[PDB]
Structure formats: C-alpha cells, structure tokens
Paper text:
Base excision repair (BER) is the pathway primarily tasked with repairing DNA base damage, with apurinic/apyrimidinic endonuclease (APE1) having both AP-endonuclease and 3′ to 5′ exonuclease (exo) DNA cleavage functions. Importantly, 3′-8-oxoG impairs the ligation step of BER and therefore must be removed by the exo activity of a surrogate enzyme to prevent double stranded breaks and cell death.
To see how the APE1 active site accommodates 3′-8-oxoG, we crystallized APE1 bound with nicked, double stranded DNA substrates containing 8-oxoG at the 3′-end and a phosphate at the 5′-end of the SSB. These substrates represent potentially unligatable, BER intermediates in which the repair polymerase, Pol β, has misinserted an 8-oxodGTP across from either a templating A or C. To obtain crystals of the substrate complexes, we employed a double-mutant catalytically dead variant of APE1 (E96Q/D210N). Specifically, DNA bending at the site of the nick results in an open intra-helical cavity in the DNA, and in both cases the 8-oxoG base is in an anti-conformation and positioned out of the protein active site into the open intra-helical cavity where it does not form any base-pairing interactions with the opposing A or C. This conformation allows the damage-containing 3′ end of the DNA nick and phosphate backbone to shift into the protein active site for cleavage. The 3′-OH of the sugar is also coordinated to N212 (OD1), while the two non-bridging oxygens are coordinated by N212 (ND2), N210 (ND2), Y171 and a water molecule. A second, ordered water molecule is in position to act as the nucleophile. N174 sits closer to the O8 of O8:A with 2.5 Å between it and the nitrogen (ND2) of the N174A side chain, however in the case of O8:C both the N174 OD1 and ND2 are within hydrogen bonding distance at 2.9 and 3.0 Å, respectively.
Numbering used by the authors: 43 to 318
Write the structure that this text describes.
DNA sequence: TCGACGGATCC
DNA sequence: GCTGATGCGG
DNA sequence: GGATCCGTCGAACGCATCAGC
C-alpha cells in the first residue's frame, strides 16, 4: 500500500519547541544526487545538520555546489582507504562541532569510509553507512563482526554522552519494516543474523528506534526502494534509514520523519526534530 | 522484485 | 571524451 | 495426467569505476 508521513510535530512531549533539525540521506552517489536537484531539496528542508551516506565520491572530487551552502558550512567527509567509487559518508553542520572523528577505533572496520562521529555540547552524533551483507550473503560473516564492534563502540560512546545514531543501517528490523518479508528472509537486509544484531544494538547500547517509538504499528513506511521493477511507484520498499536515540533523549524527541517524496536516490531522506 | 523455472504433491 | 565491461547495491 | 504447490534462478536500474585509447 501507499504511505503518507504525518505532519511534523515540532513541540516536545513537554511542549518545548524543537531547537535542532537533523536530516539524514543515503544519497547513493553524491554527484548524481546533486545533479538530480538533491541540494535544492536540502535548502528547502533547511536542516541544522545534514548527514550523507553512500557518497561514492573522493574528497578531491567534491562538487563545487557544496561550498555554496552557508547554512551547513562545517563539512566533514570520509572516503574508503582504497576502494575509489565506493561507500563514503559526510556530515554537514550549521554550527561547528566540538570534535569530529572518523571510524570506530577498530582497524578492520575503519577502512571503508563508513562512520563520522561529531561531538556537540549536549550529545554526540554518529552517522553510519553499515556494510551490506551482499548478494548471496557473501559478506554476512563480516557483517556480524561489524555489528558487534559497532555495538561495543556505541555503548562506550553513549556511556559518556547522550547519543544520536543515524543513517543507512542496512537492516529492516522487523517484518513491518519491509513490504515483502517472507521472500527476503535469506536476502541481505532481512537475515535473522542482521535482525538479531539490530535488536542487540537497541538493547546493548541501549538505543530506541525514534520512528518506531512514535509510530509503533504504522505499516508501509520505508526509506528505500530498488531502482528495478518500479518498486518506488508501488511503494515496495524497506525501512533501512533510522534515527536511534539514547533513552534520555526520548523526552527531547519531537518527531522522526520519512521524506517519502524527495527524489534523487533510491533512498529518501529522514529528519529528526529534537528540543535540546 | 518479479516472473519463469523446475520438481514434487495434490483432487 | 568516448566506448564497453565490471563492481555494488536491499 | 493435468492442474497447483513450493524453493531456485536470473536480469532488470542506476551510479561509478576500470581498461584502453
């Protein structure tokens, strides 16, 4: 079925106005995304922080348009060590962070440009492009090792400051999180291994799935659709892009959105409103 | 994702 | 720059 | 033996690299 995201709630559970708007977008090709007008949409969304995944663009090749952003002038990027048109993330912020770091501090998992950590006054923001398990599940063994190192890293982070994690986590947690769960139980993104790890991630850190916390029974809300088979026109998709929050931020949570109608990738953007 | 393939298994 | 083939992705 | 179940098998879309020139 087709999905309509409800209007933005911009007041917190205590009536306080949202002060921080974070948008996250797996652009799947930063340069093509910009050519497909992605930055225009960004300028109208006007986030305070913009997190990008699957940029597929080395630092040298960053399009000129990106410095034309004066509302997101503090920009951080991470590309793979050696694979050239692969993976990649970026973090653009209105205000300068206190401290920015790349990767999770584990050599094996910090070579594919997947993680940026940005520390702000009252929280830490992580954006991540989690490794796909791969066609025929060839990288599933590696993915399970990623899941554990990433969980352990995030647990340490969240022990020192409240944590926001966003981006393409490359799993649909539960059957409500994709249109065809039955046919996908042996495909990347919906293996029991990947689903288990996501559950362990929520419990171990701990983290809450912002969108599920507010809309725990809302079906057909997805963030990705294959380019093939006209999937997006039929809303045959997966919810792969999340905002995961420390529990102590839940009273700061105003809304967690899915921007279904913004085009330019095979993912749509998602947006978090917090009252900090 | 989808429909074409098998190879069982059924009124 | 242009073709044609390969890597990758849920 | 002619339908109807199943689990496989394959090739689409899009971006970006690579090889070669």
């Amino acid at each position: 079925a087709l999905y309509e995201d409800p209007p933005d709630q911009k007041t917190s559970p205590s009536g306080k106005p949202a002060t921080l708007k974070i948008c996250s977008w797996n652009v799947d090709g930063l340069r093509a995304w910009i050519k497909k007008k992605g930055l225009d949409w960004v300028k109208e969304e006007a986030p305070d922080i913009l997190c990008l995944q699957q940029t597929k663009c080395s630092e040298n090749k960053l399009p000129a348009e990106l410095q034309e952003l004066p509302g997101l002038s503090h920009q951080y990027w991470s590309a793979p060590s050696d694979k050239e048109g692969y993976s990649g993330v970026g973090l653009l912020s209105r205000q300068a962070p206190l401290k920015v770091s790349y990767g999770i501090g584990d050599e094996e998992h910090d070579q594919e440009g997947r993680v940026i950590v940005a520390e702000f006054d009252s929280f830490v923001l992580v954006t991540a492009y989690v490794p796909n398990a791969g066609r025929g599940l060839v990288r599933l063994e590696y993915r399970q090792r990623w899941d554990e190192a990433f969980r352990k890293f995030l647990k340490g982070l969240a022990s020192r400051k409240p944590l926001v994690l966003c981006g393409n986590l490359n799993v649909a947690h539960e059957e409500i999180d994709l249109r065809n769960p039955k046919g996908n139980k042996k495909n990347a993104g919906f293996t029991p291994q990947e689903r288990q790890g996501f559950g362990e991630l929520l419990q171990a850190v701990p983290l809450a799935d912002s969108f599920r916390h507010l809309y725990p029974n809302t079906p057909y809300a997805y963030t990705f659709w294959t380019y093939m088979m006209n999937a997006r026109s039929k809303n045959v998709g997966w919810r792969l892009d999340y905002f995961l929050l420390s529990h102590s931020l839940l009273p700061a949570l105003c809304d967690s959105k899915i921007r279904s109608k913004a085009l330019g990738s095979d993912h749509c953007p998602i947006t978090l409103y917090l009252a900090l």
